[PDB]
């Protein structure tokens, strides 16, 4: 088993993201935006993938299983508190957004804040800190 199989893949694609084949599956999946070590770990656990294998060792069907697990956390008993999009503003649904969907959600939040002239939105627009930090001495880049 120590010898690489002929099917070993050095580079694989998932949601238009390059995934390193040499990295372990748990930490290889983290290259996708919106997926971290905790979420990747639980997704691998729920998909029955063996955590000791590399990203390139597995088969494509296992990547599809991982993606369905990620896209339907509720179906696999992943709790609501474990998701990065809880109680959505418009739909009010709980889901794990990833890749360009995460950027779309972030842009929607920022533009919604800016449209109503909310203070946080104005701070975002001006390029200043939004979480109350002092700005006299730190955060100097331009």
């Amino acid at each position: 088993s120590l010898v690489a199989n002929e099917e070993f893949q050095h580079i694989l694609r998932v949601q238009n993201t390059n995934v390193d084949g040499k990295q372990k599956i748990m930490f290889a999946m983290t290259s996708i935006k919106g997926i971290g070590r905790r979420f990747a770990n639980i997704a691998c656990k729920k998909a029955d993938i063996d955590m000791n294998k590399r990203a390139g060792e597995l088969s494509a069907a296992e990547l599809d299983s991982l993606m369905v697990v990620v896209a339907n956390p509720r179906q696999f008993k992943i709790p609501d508190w474990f998701l990065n999009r809880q109680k959505d503003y418009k739909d009010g649904k709980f889901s794990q957004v990833t890749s360009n969907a995460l950027d779309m959600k972030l842009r929607d939040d920022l533009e919604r804040l800016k449209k109503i002239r909310n203070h946080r939105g104005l701070r975002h627009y001006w390029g200043l800190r939004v979480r109350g930090q002092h700005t006299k001495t730190t955060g100097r880049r331009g």
Binding site: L2, V3, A4, F8, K22, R54, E57
Partner: protein
């Protein structure tokens, strides 16, 4: 500098090279195997475990942060 392109899984040539020469090394450690066979530390540890299972090497002293192995026979 140039990054080291260590392999996480053996190819047939490197695996045969391991099985041939590694049992003849005076000192065997994961770092030594990684530097010689040009393999990752994890693959070096797995190869050391495999060689120990085969009985071709012996354990001089085992520690979490340092494993020292040597050829079974002179």
């Amino acid at each position: 500098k140039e990054k080291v392109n260590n392999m996480v899984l053996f190819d047939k040539a490197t695996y045969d090279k391991l099985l041939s020469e590694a049992p003849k090394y005076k000192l065997i450690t994961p770092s030594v195997l990684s530097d010689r066979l040009r393999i990752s530390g994890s693959l070096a540890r797995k190869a050391i475990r495999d060689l120990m299972a085969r009985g071709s090497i012996r354990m001089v002293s085992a520690h979490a942060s340092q494993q020292i192995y040597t050829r079974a026979t002179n």
